[PDB]
Amino acid sequence: ETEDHLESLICKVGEKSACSLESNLEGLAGVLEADLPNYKSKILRLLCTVARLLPEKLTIYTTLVGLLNARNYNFGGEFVEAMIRQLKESLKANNYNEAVYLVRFLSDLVNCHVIAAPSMVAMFENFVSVTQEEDVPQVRRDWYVYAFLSSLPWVGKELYEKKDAEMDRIFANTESYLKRRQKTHVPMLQVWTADKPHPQEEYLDCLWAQIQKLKKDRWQERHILRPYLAFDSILCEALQHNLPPFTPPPHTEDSVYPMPRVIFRMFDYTDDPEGPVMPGSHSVERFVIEENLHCIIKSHWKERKTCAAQLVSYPGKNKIPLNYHIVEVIFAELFQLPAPPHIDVMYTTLLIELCKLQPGSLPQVLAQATEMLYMRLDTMNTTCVDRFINWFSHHLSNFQFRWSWEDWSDCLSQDPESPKPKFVREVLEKCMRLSYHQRILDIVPPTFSALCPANPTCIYKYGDESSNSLPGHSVALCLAVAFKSKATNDEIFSILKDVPNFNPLKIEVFVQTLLHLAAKSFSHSFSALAKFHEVFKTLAESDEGKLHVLRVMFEVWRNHPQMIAVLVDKMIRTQIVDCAAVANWIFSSELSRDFTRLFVWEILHSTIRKMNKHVLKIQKELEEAKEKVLEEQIERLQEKVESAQSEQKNLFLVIFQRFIMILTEHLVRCETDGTSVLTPWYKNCIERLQQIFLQHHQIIQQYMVTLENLLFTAELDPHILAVFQQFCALQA
Amino acid sequence: LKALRSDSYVELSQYRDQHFRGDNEEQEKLLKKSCTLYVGNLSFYTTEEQIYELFSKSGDIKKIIMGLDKMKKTACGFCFVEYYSRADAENAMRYINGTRLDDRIIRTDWDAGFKEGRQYGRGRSGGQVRDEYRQDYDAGRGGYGKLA
Ligand SMILES: C[n+]1cn([C@@H]2O[C@H](COP(=O)(O)OP(=O)(O)OP(=O)(O)OC[C@H]3O[C@@H](n4cnc5c(=O)[nH]c(N)nc54)[C@H](O)[C@@H]3O)[C@@H](O)[C@H]2O)c2nc(N)[nH]c(=O)c21
Ligand SMILES: [Mg+2]
């Protein structure tokens, strides 16, 4: 019971009360002291937890650890003892993001008279000292500075009342360090390359610039709520403590540090003239506001309805354009490179839940942001655009596809390849897949019809062709007859024995015919593949066969991207074709004209994931089997791991070799015909290569020797190398 | 660690298949380990293609089984979606449940598992039982309830 009640109450304070917060902190303060005799360990645990899991409540709980320290010095000393232990653990386990919340909780305690202001400074001095450390990854040297600077919004003001001498010498080594960092990763992490309207800044430079405006403002920010402010009477005479000498953990080969980031920015106060002035991009208020909002989503991501509510009720010290901050932060997460913190579809419905909660004001802002995103499309990164398309099209389908399409009339007279028209075409294509062809033709104006998606009709070769000069024609006609008759494999094989030339012609007449007679639904085509599965495994026993199947299937369904995708997927899972073949198919000349369409990549990544999932699965089995006949298996599971990983490496190897080949071909041709290198085709192609790295950087890391010395070498065009070097900078 | 673990969208519903064999205990053990979902309120004309496109947003789908009129053998207004992993089914439960599929608000529920015969409406008239007593008009489910 009691155990239970404590955790309940510890949370109540953070939650929205119905009696001034200060009161609750007053009460809970004593209550907790009264229970210290019997429940010291639990309360000591509960607080260390809320400290690393409820950052958005940082100051409500620091206060609490204060009122307590103001009634039991020895207690505070124990809490501060745990915190350091808890912090040393998070660090050793590579859970750096959790550490920051700890390191930041300590910081604010100094404002609660619990930790010696001078004490904090000594630790930070050691954090920055990491910048000197020799032969360590920059992402490591980066995290300590970030942990330091991100704290100042809380500690800085009072941490400036003391040790300014060293608290100047630290900024000194920082400034020095900040100007010596390589920024190779920025181009690969920016959502937009355009400097206007808003520059997308490297996260440390942006924060550095933020501290400055604060420092030069005498460290007086006006957002961070401080309950420990209305308790100066008590906290005053409290006896602070001293954090033991903190020696940052030595960089090991098992260390993994957060990747660098780029600050997503799309709004400024002019985007909301008639609304409370929006904190500027270089104001710490902006940082803190987005930080808490990001943390709120991190705490409630699993429950969308609770999530919207915690966001909308966010407590701001001084009024701010909340709705705008909520939308900006959600897009900041959806469009985050390499990946969003949470599953993509979560942002879609989260936004819906926010529109249902603030019916009168959220929708307009969301509609304003959509407009702005569309207008800045010209320099948005391909990976984000895809995300934009899927979000917007899925969003539309929840609001009867109602949108003011004429607002985007400008796309109508642009090269079909330009980002705007292409974006519209893709969005519409996506809307069709969530409903049907005719429905979409009906939602857009007559002027847009040209951008609507083609009717997804099957294309039989030997069909009502009547153009019979084609090879295997009659053979196909027998097949059609057999299939409609519940033919068997051997029978079909027989029909196929009468085919003149790995036999390309046999494949084509089989596929063209089998697919045509199952073109009514996905479920038909599937069973079709399952029934005559044996035939497939025969005709396509070779890679040429595998490749030819994909080629004929594409010939048949080129007007129905969703069909093509589900078929390839089904084919891979039933081993009618393998990923290598799918990869070669993607870069094949037969797809050259559709190379920049979304479905092509949606398929390639879905193939890569199946490969990855597969590898992971077998590895685990070995893992479990190794944790125990039982041997003959581990002998076998080992072999399977080998093959799986080998085929995985080969998939990345081929994909990269193909990218290098087509990009060089373009670069050379251009550098010969004195033509522009920056074509729409180039943009998609170079950014698609970048995406391979972004989506699977973890797996790719295992190939550094091969990648660094065998593929992406110096004889390669710098435009291609650039992509590789950007990737290496992610964990450099 | 603490109550942040809250996952109300993934919790078991009140529904229980009355034709299932085992205890309520055996049905519940299957439900908490399932990868297959029950999808309700579709229109009679909602296709497998649409279902695939929306439900794939939460992970890869293994199979989709359309609910049918036991006697007419036509789309009934419900279906079963089966994922390869429960994590993906949970996300559908979390972010797809309660949203629009083919212009109508759908509801997902954990399902013990598909078995031959689960695809047919148990509705007295062939369709879903739900439609026998519906007193509302629904042009996606054939107008008024069967008792009308
Ligand atoms: C609704 N539902 C169906 N299936 C599956 O889909 C198939 C179609 O059969 P139904 O023909 O859809 O089947 P039942 O639900 O068996 O019977 P029933 O539970 O009695 O219940 C309720 C619906 O009918 C209504 N109803 C039932 N009896 C009465 C009555 O006497 N009066 C009134 N007014 N309404 C009633 C009621 O409002 C209710 O919501 C079956 O294979 C099921 O396993 C579900 N599977 C899961 N996991 N979760 C669900 O929520 C679910
Ligand atoms: Mg290697």
Short mmCIF file of N, CA and C in Angstrom, two decimals, chain A residues 7 49 53 299 301-305 343 345-346 349 390 394 397-398 400 430 433-435 439 521-523 526 562 569-570 573 606, chain B residues 1-2 4-9 48-50 52-54 57-58 60-62 64 84 91 93-100 102-103:
data_model
loop_
_atom_site.label_atom_id
_atom_site.label_comp_id
_atom_site.label_asym_id
_atom_site.label_seq_id
_atom_site.Cartn_x
_atom_site.Cartn_y
_atom_site.Cartn_z
N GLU A 7 4.67 6.87 -4.43
CA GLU A 7 4.83 7.10 -5.86
C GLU A 7 3.65 7.92 -6.39
N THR A 49 14.29 8.63 -9.76
CA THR A 49 13.63 8.20 -10.97
C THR A 49 12.98 9.39 -11.65
N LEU A 53 13.45 10.70 -15.51
CA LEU A 53 12.36 10.36 -16.41
C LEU A 53 11.35 11.49 -16.57
N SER A 299 7.45 11.37 -22.96
CA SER A 299 6.82 10.77 -21.80
C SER A 299 5.44 10.21 -22.09
N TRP A 301 4.22 9.52 -25.53
CA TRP A 301 4.07 9.07 -26.91
C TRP A 301 3.14 7.87 -27.12
N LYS A 302 3.09 6.94 -26.16
CA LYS A 302 2.23 5.76 -26.30
C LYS A 302 0.72 6.05 -26.22
N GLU A 303 0.34 7.11 -25.52
CA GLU A 303 -1.07 7.49 -25.40
C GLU A 303 -1.27 8.86 -26.04
N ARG A 304 -1.81 8.86 -27.26
CA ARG A 304 -2.00 10.09 -28.01
C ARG A 304 -2.90 11.15 -27.37
N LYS A 305 -3.98 10.72 -26.74
CA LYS A 305 -4.93 11.65 -26.13
C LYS A 305 -4.33 12.32 -24.88
N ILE A 343 7.78 6.39 -33.94
CA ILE A 343 7.20 5.91 -35.19
C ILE A 343 6.40 7.02 -35.89
N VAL A 345 3.79 7.43 -37.91
CA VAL A 345 2.33 7.55 -37.85
C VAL A 345 1.83 8.18 -36.54
N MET A 346 2.69 8.21 -35.53
CA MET A 346 2.33 8.76 -34.25
C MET A 346 2.10 10.26 -34.32
N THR A 349 -1.60 11.16 -36.01
CA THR A 349 -2.75 11.11 -35.12
C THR A 349 -2.56 12.03 -33.91
N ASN A 390 3.72 11.47 -47.10
CA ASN A 390 2.99 10.47 -46.33
C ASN A 390 2.17 11.08 -45.20
N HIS A 394 -1.90 11.13 -45.54
CA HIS A 394 -2.61 10.37 -44.53
C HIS A 394 -3.51 11.32 -43.74
N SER A 397 -6.77 12.15 -45.64
CA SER A 397 -7.74 11.05 -45.63
C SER A 397 -8.58 10.97 -44.37
N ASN A 398 -8.22 11.77 -43.36
CA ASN A 398 -8.97 11.78 -42.11
C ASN A 398 -9.91 12.99 -42.07
N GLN A 400 -11.72 14.01 -45.04
CA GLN A 400 -12.35 13.91 -46.35
C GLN A 400 -11.58 14.51 -47.51
N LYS A 430 -0.67 8.97 -53.24
CA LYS A 430 -0.86 8.40 -51.92
C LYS A 430 -2.33 8.44 -51.50
N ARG A 433 -4.25 5.52 -53.02
CA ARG A 433 -4.01 4.26 -52.34
C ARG A 433 -4.78 4.15 -51.02
N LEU A 434 -5.18 5.29 -50.44
CA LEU A 434 -5.96 5.26 -49.20
C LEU A 434 -7.47 5.25 -49.51
N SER A 435 -7.80 5.32 -50.80
CA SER A 435 -9.20 5.29 -51.24
C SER A 435 -9.26 4.65 -52.63
N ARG A 439 -12.14 8.88 -56.79
CA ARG A 439 -12.31 9.78 -55.65
C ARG A 439 -11.34 10.97 -55.68
N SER A 521 -7.49 -8.82 -57.17
CA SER A 521 -7.18 -8.46 -55.80
C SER A 521 -5.77 -8.88 -55.38
N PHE A 522 -5.30 -8.30 -54.27
CA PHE A 522 -3.98 -8.63 -53.73
C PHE A 522 -4.00 -10.08 -53.28
N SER A 523 -5.09 -10.46 -52.62
CA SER A 523 -5.21 -11.82 -52.10
C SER A 523 -5.20 -12.91 -53.16
N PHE A 526 -1.50 -13.22 -54.45
CA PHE A 526 -0.73 -13.90 -53.41
C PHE A 526 -0.90 -15.42 -53.55
N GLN A 562 1.38 0.26 -55.75
CA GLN A 562 1.05 -0.46 -54.52
C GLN A 562 1.03 -1.97 -54.76
N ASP A 569 7.51 -7.70 -52.06
CA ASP A 569 7.61 -8.10 -50.66
C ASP A 569 7.27 -9.57 -50.53
N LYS A 570 6.10 -9.96 -51.04
CA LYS A 570 5.65 -11.35 -50.97
C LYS A 570 6.63 -12.31 -51.63
N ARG A 573 9.75 -12.73 -49.29
CA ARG A 573 9.43 -13.55 -48.14
C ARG A 573 9.25 -15.02 -48.47
N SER A 606 12.14 -1.38 -47.88
CA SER A 606 11.36 -2.46 -47.32
C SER A 606 12.12 -3.78 -47.54
N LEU B 1 10.01 2.94 -15.62
CA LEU B 1 9.83 2.44 -14.23
C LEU B 1 8.43 2.77 -13.70
N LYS B 2 8.16 4.05 -13.45
CA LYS B 2 6.85 4.47 -12.93
C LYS B 2 5.69 4.45 -13.94
N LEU B 4 4.60 5.94 -16.14
CA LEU B 4 4.76 6.43 -17.50
C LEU B 4 4.50 5.25 -18.43
N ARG B 5 4.53 4.05 -17.85
CA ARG B 5 4.31 2.81 -18.58
C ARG B 5 2.90 2.74 -19.17
N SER B 6 2.03 3.65 -18.73
CA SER B 6 0.66 3.68 -19.19
C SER B 6 0.56 3.43 -20.69
N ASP B 7 -0.25 2.44 -21.07
CA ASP B 7 -0.45 2.07 -22.48
C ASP B 7 -1.92 1.71 -22.62
N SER B 8 -2.81 2.65 -22.35
CA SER B 8 -4.23 2.34 -22.42
C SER B 8 -4.74 1.81 -23.75
N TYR B 9 -4.16 2.25 -24.86
CA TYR B 9 -4.62 1.79 -26.17
C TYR B 9 -4.33 0.33 -26.48
N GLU B 48 -9.27 -4.64 -49.59
CA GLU B 48 -8.06 -5.17 -48.98
C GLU B 48 -6.90 -4.26 -49.33
N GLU B 49 -7.01 -3.58 -50.47
CA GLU B 49 -5.97 -2.67 -50.92
C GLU B 49 -5.89 -1.46 -49.99
N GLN B 50 -7.05 -0.96 -49.57
CA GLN B 50 -7.07 0.22 -48.70
C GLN B 50 -6.56 -0.17 -47.33
N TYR B 52 -4.52 -2.53 -46.56
CA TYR B 52 -3.07 -2.73 -46.64
C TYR B 52 -2.30 -1.41 -46.53
N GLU B 53 -2.79 -0.39 -47.21
CA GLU B 53 -2.14 0.91 -47.23
C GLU B 53 -2.16 1.65 -45.90
N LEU B 54 -3.26 1.55 -45.17
CA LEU B 54 -3.36 2.22 -43.89
C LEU B 54 -2.66 1.44 -42.79
N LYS B 57 1.21 1.31 -42.25
CA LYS B 57 1.88 2.46 -41.67
C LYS B 57 2.45 2.19 -40.29
N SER B 58 2.02 1.09 -39.68
CA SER B 58 2.49 0.74 -38.35
C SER B 58 3.40 -0.47 -38.33
N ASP B 60 4.97 -4.07 -41.11
CA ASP B 60 4.65 -4.98 -42.20
C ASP B 60 3.54 -5.98 -41.89
N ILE B 61 2.58 -6.05 -42.81
CA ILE B 61 1.44 -6.94 -42.68
C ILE B 61 1.75 -8.29 -43.29
N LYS B 62 1.33 -9.35 -42.62
CA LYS B 62 1.57 -10.70 -43.10
C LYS B 62 0.38 -11.19 -43.91
N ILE B 64 -4.20 -10.41 -44.57
CA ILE B 64 -5.43 -9.70 -44.29
C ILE B 64 -6.59 -10.61 -44.72
N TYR B 84 3.65 -9.33 -38.48
CA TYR B 84 4.69 -10.32 -38.26
C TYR B 84 5.19 -10.19 -36.83
N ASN B 91 1.38 -0.75 -32.23
CA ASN B 91 1.37 0.59 -32.79
C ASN B 91 0.11 0.85 -33.62
N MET B 93 -2.73 -0.45 -32.93
CA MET B 93 -3.68 -0.34 -31.83
C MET B 93 -3.59 1.07 -31.24
N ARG B 94 -2.35 1.56 -31.09
CA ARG B 94 -2.09 2.89 -30.54
C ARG B 94 -2.41 4.09 -31.41
N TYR B 95 -2.06 4.02 -32.70
CA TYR B 95 -2.24 5.16 -33.60
C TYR B 95 -3.16 4.99 -34.81
N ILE B 96 -3.68 3.80 -35.04
CA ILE B 96 -4.56 3.63 -36.19
C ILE B 96 -5.99 3.45 -35.70
N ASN B 97 -6.13 2.74 -34.59
CA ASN B 97 -7.43 2.51 -33.97
C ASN B 97 -8.11 3.87 -33.74
N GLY B 98 -9.38 3.97 -34.10
CA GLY B 98 -10.09 5.21 -33.87
C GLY B 98 -9.94 6.29 -34.92
N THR B 99 -9.23 5.98 -36.01
CA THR B 99 -9.04 6.94 -37.09
C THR B 99 -9.82 6.50 -38.34
N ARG B 100 -9.68 7.24 -39.44
CA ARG B 100 -10.39 6.96 -40.69
C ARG B 100 -9.73 6.00 -41.67
N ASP B 102 -10.97 4.58 -45.33
CA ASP B 102 -12.00 4.66 -46.34
C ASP B 102 -13.15 5.54 -45.88
N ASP B 103 -12.80 6.71 -45.37
CA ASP B 103 -13.76 7.71 -44.92
C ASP B 103 -14.58 7.40 -43.68
#
